[PDB]
Structure 1
Amino acid sequence: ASENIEVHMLNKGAEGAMVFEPAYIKANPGDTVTFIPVDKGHNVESIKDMIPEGAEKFKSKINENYVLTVTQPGAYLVKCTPHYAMGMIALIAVGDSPANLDQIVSAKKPKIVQERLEKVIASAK
């Protein structure tokens, strides 16, 4: 059955400024991921060419409490639209060994995004 993972959108947290907590979400097809505007100024947006095959792009409204249903297996790198350069990202992994994760890891993106991404991958391993 579908399960839900809550994600807080924060001005600052464990990893520094402009964070999603958690920044790693392990899910399966049909689960939901709920993004909560704990602090103002944030949203969630799928990153270009960093969501799985067959998945639809998405972009929430600033300060919206946005419930995403994930169905397509693979990895999703999401950003906060204004705060991408500051590192405000999260990785959603749907199913095991997400096929596009290595591609996402190799893709052009800011150094701080790369650092935060690599950290959550290492923590999940």
Structure 2
Amino acid sequence: ENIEVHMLNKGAEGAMVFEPAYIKANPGDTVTFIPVDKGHNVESIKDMIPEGAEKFKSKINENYVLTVTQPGAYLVKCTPHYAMGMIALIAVGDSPANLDQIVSAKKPKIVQERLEKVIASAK
């Protein structure tokens, strides 16, 4: 099953956002990132995707279809806007085993606030 995510200059959480910023998925699902506004892409954050998952980085302004297979948590960023908090969390399966690690990892303050928000909303 496919989940669509919009890449935006501005949205509900402020500037430089993925909508949704939390994607709940199962193995074999696709997540389709749509460049509604220009200037955006999607890239896996290093040491913030599951064991066995392949890193990725899409082309700026490209419609990108990510297939997620490995269970666990994936923190993805918009490469230019990571420092402005432009991130999404993908959770594949229940109780993603690497979520607490990702939460504890070094990352921009604004990214952290946004990440904690979607985790709390998902509970």
TM-score normalised by structure 2 residue count? 1.00
Residues 2-50 of structure 1 show CA distances to partners (whole Å, capped at 9, x for unaligned) of: x000000000000000000000000000000000000000000000000
Once the two structures are superposed, what CA deviation does each residue of 1:43-65 show, in whole Å capped at 9, x if it has no partner? 00000000000000000000000
**Corresponding residue of 2:52:** 54
Q: What is the distance in 1 between the residues matched to 2:66 and 2:42?
A: 10
Q: In structure 2, what is the equivalent of residue 18 of structure 1?
A: 16
Distance, in Å, in 2 between the alignment partners of 1:70 and 1:84 is: 21
CA deviations over 1:104-124 (Å, ceiling 9, x no partner): 000000000000000000000
| Residue aligning to 2:93 | 95
SS of 1:82's partner is coil
Q: CA deviation at 1:86?
A: 0.1
| SS of residue paired to 1:114 | helix
TM-superposed deviation, 1:97? 0.2
Cα distance in 2 for residues equivalent to 1:81 and 1:111: 16
Deviation for aligned residue 1:99: 0.1
Deviation (angstroms), 1:70: 0.1
Other structure's SS at 1:93 match:
strand
Q: CA RMSD in A?
A: 0.2
After superposing on structure 2, the runs of 4+ consecutive aligned residues of structure 1 that deviate more than 2 Å are: none
Tell me, in whole angstroms, the C-alpha distance in 1 between the residues paired with 2:108 and 2:68: 25
Match of 1:44 in 2: 42
Runs (5+) with no aligned partner, structure 2:
none
Counterpart-to-counterpart distance in 2, 1:64 and 1:30 = 21
Counterpart secondary structure, 1:69: strand
Gaps of 5+ in 1: none
**Following the alignment from structure 1 to structure 2, what is the Cα–Cα distance between the partners of residues 110 and 57?**
20
1:85 counterpart SS class: helix
- Report the equivalent of 2:115: 117
